[PDB]
Design an enzyme around this catalytic site. Structure first.
Site, short mmCIF file in Angstrom:
data_model
loop_
_atom_site.label_atom_id
_atom_site.label_comp_id
_atom_site.label_asym_id
_atom_site.label_seq_id
_atom_site.Cartn_x
_atom_site.Cartn_y
_atom_site.Cartn_z
N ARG A 172 12.70 -22.34 19.94
CA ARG A 172 12.08 -22.39 22.00
C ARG A 172 11.39 -23.56 21.66
O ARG A 172 9.79 -23.71 21.53
CB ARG A 172 11.37 -21.18 21.86
CG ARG A 172 12.14 -19.55 21.78
CD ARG A 172 11.59 -18.32 22.41
NE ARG A 172 12.05 -16.97 22.23
CZ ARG A 172 12.46 -16.46 21.63
NH1 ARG A 172 12.25 -16.49 20.41
NH2 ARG A 172 12.96 -15.92 21.22
N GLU A 205 0.74 -1.11 0.22
CA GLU A 205 0.00 -0.01 0.09
C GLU A 205 1.07 1.00 0.32
O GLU A 205 0.52 2.28 -0.63
CB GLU A 205 -0.69 0.02 0.59
CG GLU A 205 -2.21 -1.12 0.57
CD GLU A 205 -2.95 -1.11 1.43
OE1 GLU A 205 -3.89 0.19 2.62
OE2 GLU A 205 -3.76 -2.04 1.31
N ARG A 230 20.14 -15.41 22.33
CA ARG A 230 19.75 -17.16 22.41
C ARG A 230 20.82 -17.98 22.87
O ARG A 230 20.30 -19.50 23.14
CB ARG A 230 18.93 -17.26 20.87
CG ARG A 230 17.77 -16.94 20.90
CD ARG A 230 16.68 -16.88 21.41
NE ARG A 230 16.50 -18.79 21.98
CZ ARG A 230 15.98 -19.16 20.87
NH1 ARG A 230 15.09 -18.62 19.69
NH2 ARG A 230 15.70 -20.35 21.40
O1 LIG Z 1 11.98 -12.65 15.94
C1 LIG Z 1 12.25 -12.20 17.52
N1 LIG Z 1 12.72 -10.83 17.58
C2 LIG Z 1 12.97 -10.41 18.80
C3 LIG Z 1 14.20 -11.18 19.89
F1 LIG Z 1 14.22 -10.23 20.45
C4 LIG Z 1 13.97 -12.66 19.39
O2 LIG Z 1 14.52 -13.25 20.22
N2 LIG Z 1 13.40 -12.96 18.05
#
Ligand SMILES: O=c1[nH]cc(F)c(=O)[nH]1
Ligand SMILES: O=c1[nH]cc(F)c(=O)[nH]1
Ligand SMILES: O=c1[nH]cc(F)c(=O)[nH]1
Ligand SMILES: O=c1[nH]cc(F)c(=O)[nH]1
Ligand SMILES: O=c1[nH]cc(F)c(=O)[nH]1
Ligand SMILES: O=c1[nH]cc(F)c(=O)[nH]1
Ligand SMILES: [K+]
Ligand SMILES: [K+]
Ligand SMILES: [K+]
EC number: 2.4.2.3
Lengths: 245, 245, 242, 246, 248, 244
Positions: free
Chosen positions: F166, F78, F221
């Site tokens: 996760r 858009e 992570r």
């Molecule tokens: O997609 C994501 N955004 C922000 C983050 F901290 C993460 O771990 N994963």
């Protein structure tokens, strides 16, 4: 019995290690009746089986029904009973104009338009026939002077859309299969059937020998539906069986 | 400068040749042509070295393909434009079955398509399957010279290292798809690895060209990864070429 | 004969628009005999077809054989002949600990571990049952009083590797299906059978109504090979859909 | 008596080299090498011809790959075992955008993966993307010498014929997957076709190696399929880019 | 502060609620909540706006998911961590069947997976199927309200434009996979397009959560591409609330 | 009224703007716009808050995309209809390489396409690659302000939980495709995870639009699963000046 679907025991095979596997149950008896000492073994669902002798050797003749899924059950259960060589004989629709009704087709390998093959090997694995079996089928064909073609076959999980038939309830064909006949045609594919890719794949990836021979009953460049003799493909599969015992 | 962009050849050069023999190694082209009558060097561009020769009075082409399906596909396509209809590949290979020894000869009925070039001629469902006349002529050639032969399926990979699950490399890692793969090919009866057969067989079988595949074993992967520093195969392919002319 | 495999004419159907389609051809007569004026029509290959009356209308009972392929044949040729609604009754192996042998399963949708379904719709398309048929099957089971479970079924092109059986000639299962039963189990899948994916997909993608009910004959959390309420349910469901 | 199986090279041959320039054509290796100091032939096996040279004091390798991703994967892998960390590819290419003329220079930022070998290094989702440092060096070299340059996406094909949608062939057919494909890559803004970039870029990006890519246009596919019979800006650019990447 | 990363809610905020209504638009959350007893605004972060209300003595959550499978997948998962077991999606949709009118109500049995998020929960072979109880409660809710209702398969697309084969766009181009696709879904009997159900349905069906999907038609694609700014009906809203009574 | 269905904007609202800065958080739009000249709120519908402002005499748009490719694809389409030709994304991200610290800035050259939307613009073989002029601007901007920067590949995922492997989730399960995937991306040198870049990059690169991507690292992570600054904002505005 020894196996879940077939209702057969190792005792019923009497040492047999080769099986001739037509698609149609009602053909089982007629094939066995070409050999010595035909005896009916069992009849459950689409699996009809007979035992016969060829040159003093036990041979099994068992129907697989239509399609990869039931075919895979017959092969697997027959393997548990000691079969190691499978010669399929079926009917087929030809897609090359130069192949005539009555002709005999020997499949070196199959385009995998089925689903069961994938339960045995990933797509990149070839649905290829055993060389000894194919040789034997070819040489049998020549010995009886049949018009024979050897090459690749298209193996479809459906009779209609996967073989690009349009004369159907929906009159429609999903994208993947639209125009596909002419594609296989340009690629030299000889014919369409429904069991070869399952049979060839599961056997080539498990140490079993399989060969496929078929009688042409309709040519798709002309019509979609076969009319109301196949005997050639039969004489050839029995004669190849002899050469493999 | 000629009729084809990469090979630098003219139709006049082939002098009616209709069968080519296609090694991977440019260096081995002369050695093979010299085993036949009237060998004449034609051209040498990039990795495409080609000679002409004569076998029982008929012109034959010898032409290297280089490593891998993309240059193989160039050379087959340009040779076919020049009139070649039958191709026989001679190559080296790593065996993956324990019972197969260095020095043995493998004849490929069909290949696992672990390449990309084949996909440019036929979808993955199509079998990378050898012509039956070529395969028979190789097998019967190998018997005439008394070589140890194995006939079967070959894994055909776009890489020498990860695609053949070699770990002794820079990264020392193998992508998920191929991690564990060699053991799987072993369980399915795959005989060997090499790098050109999937592309060769697929493009030929889907375009009406006849192709066979023969290879000498130079290493057994059950023992080591890299082959040692170091003729059956060559004799066999020349002899099969004779039977096919 | 107006169709190639079934050996049937439109005349044989006497206007039938609904079919009950079991897998085993030896089961067709029993099902048909639960209804009125059961008549044997045809029997070719694995396709055994009977006609009967229910709710004062013609109904078809017709076996499909094992697997999507011969199923896609039966469904297509019956459709050509007038059938608009298909009620599948089969046997199945449960994969959830709480599902016992003799229980009845109604499939809402199927995991497409088959090939024939792709000849009708690409993989993204759900192999989903018609909502009217599914309702008619579930309410029929609540009236019969059977122990019933409703949900997703895994529909396989093979009985052995596709259903992760290892007691086989090879003892091997291809990478795709290795560990796959525990995966389906953890995703709430109830059971395994071999035809539902093809039936559901080809029907939901061509304006036909289909539903699926099965009796459990083995529980896979206990064993690989197995050592009448579903029949009453499927007949009563058809009654409601007419 | 070598350390690697295909290239026939030892780690001592490279004399500390860490950057390699990689042409497709074996015959162009000497010529490129001679553009630098101390050019010396190393080995020559199959399609792999390799020369050593020196660039502003530092040893450099020039090594051909042959045509295609398979032989490229080999050369790159074995070079990396011998110490190479940076790979600059120099090639020929066919443009498919109307505004790109023969003689123009193209720098690839990433490639369409129409090959097979890249998948042996990463799944399809992973981008065959060039290293940002190499891509900057190539772009700034091209501008310093005033070459007409185009920077963007390249389609890298496992074939020369059907994959680049040539119909003037023995079969005259192109498989479904590739039918209509050239027009699609055009609409998508793809500059050109060649045959090695996807493999080279994917395998280097996923294995901690730096890769760059620059090519000379020798035919425009809106004009014709096969390039004619027959300045040198591309090769000049790759050697210049290397001086900055050392 | 809170127990979940995006929503900003604690288990206490839900007051033991087990069912949530999940519209797409944040601005719709208040309206739906206001239809029930004791509406209370919980939190509002990014596109996640959440209210709590009481339906038949049971606590209920209304939470907006935003457009698309990705943000939907976030809401559903964090609501699940907080104890929600049943999800009812209400949205707008464009019909692709000629016989479906603007203002009509659609109840999705299962969805064509033209999304990416569902594949993060289950392989493509797995059906994106709604829960049978949720679907039933929705259909029966629709009967009671006397709404013009269609039950069937929905095409759930990761984009609004090319994925739903819209050509009036900046490029005016639709990639080969989606070219001619609308008419294909039409012939396969698919009712409508939206952007969330494939992800919702799949992640629910494969994680032991119940989900159902109802939508109000705001345009018919056999007539036009963009909905007019009308025959609009707030029936869907009433339907989902009444369905929630049945599922409580 | 409005010219575009979701954004509620007319071309008159843009006043000639051809560049947009596009964050994910609607709440961030005003704070980013307030860093420039003459900031004015245009509209706010659902998750698309849009402001206009001037940068060195030239109008620029700041418009939020929301989370994920599907809504990003809407906002980009858009805005494109309204005349936007260059898109500069600024986001937050989780690093997956141990050497990358929280607070460091990441510039994405290209993305691993773990989304679905990107496929609605180009097939999977096509690279999700940033525009070279935008990437150049971002990188030189980061160098200008003196921030710790990493340039490279990003993994773009259609989910926050399973797609980013996760396990602390309701089901504590990860489907086969993504099981073991983080370690795989790590070994391939992937820098980080986010959720919008694959879509933005593919649709822009296949449609003759320019896009860049820069992100602030909020978590690593290798240290933890859930996060517990302002440099990326400075950089995307400074880069905006260079692209004008
Ligand atoms: O997609 C994501 N955004 C922000 C983050 F901290 C993460 O771990 N994963
Ligand atoms: O699968 C098939 N079997 C027999 C035929 F005649 C045909 O056309 N197709
Ligand atoms: O591709 C290959 N060629 C030769 C070999 F010895 C081998 O292992 N692999
Ligand atoms: O497909 C199947 N049919 C019957 C069974 F018992 C089973 O487990 N699987
Ligand atoms: O791969 C290619 N290299 C060079 C060319 F000119 C072309 O068109 N294709
Ligand atoms: O995803 C959609 N939502 C609403 C609509 F009207 C439409 O056409 N598509
Ligand atoms: K080569
Ligand atoms: K059958
Ligand atoms: K959103």
């Amino acid at each position: 019995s020894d196996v879940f679907h077939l209702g057969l025991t190792k005792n019923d095979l009497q040492g047999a290690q080769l099986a001739i596997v037509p698609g149609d149950p009602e053909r089982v008896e007629k094939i066995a009746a070409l050999m010595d000492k035909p005896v009916k073994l069992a009849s459950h669902r689409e699996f009809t089986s007979w035992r016969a002798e060829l040159d003093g050797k036990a041979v099994i003749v068992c129907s697989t029904g239509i399609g990869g899924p039931s075919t895979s059950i017959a092969v697997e259960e027959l393997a548990q009973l000691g079969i190691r060589t499978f010669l399929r004989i079926g009917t087929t629709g030809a897609i090359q104009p130069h192949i005539n009704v009555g002709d005999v087709l020997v499949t070196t390998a199959s385009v995998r338009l089925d689903g069961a093959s994938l339960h045995f090997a990933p797509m990149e694995f070839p649905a290829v026939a055993d060389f000894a079996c194919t040789t034997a089928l070819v040489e049998a064909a020549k010995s009886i002077g049949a018009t024979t073609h050897v090459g690749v076959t298209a193996s479809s999980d459906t009779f209609y859309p996967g073989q690009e038939r349009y004369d159907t309830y929906s009159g429609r064909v999903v994208r993947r299969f639209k125009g596909s006949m002419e594609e296989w045609q340009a690629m030299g594919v000889m014919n369409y059937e429904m069991e070869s890719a399952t049979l060839l794949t599961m056997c080539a990836s498990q140490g079993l020998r399989a060969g496929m021979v078929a009688g042409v009953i309709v040519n798709r460049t002309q019509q979609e539906i076969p009319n109301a003799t196949e005997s050639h493909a039969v004489k050839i599969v029995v004669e190849a069986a002899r050469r493999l015992l």
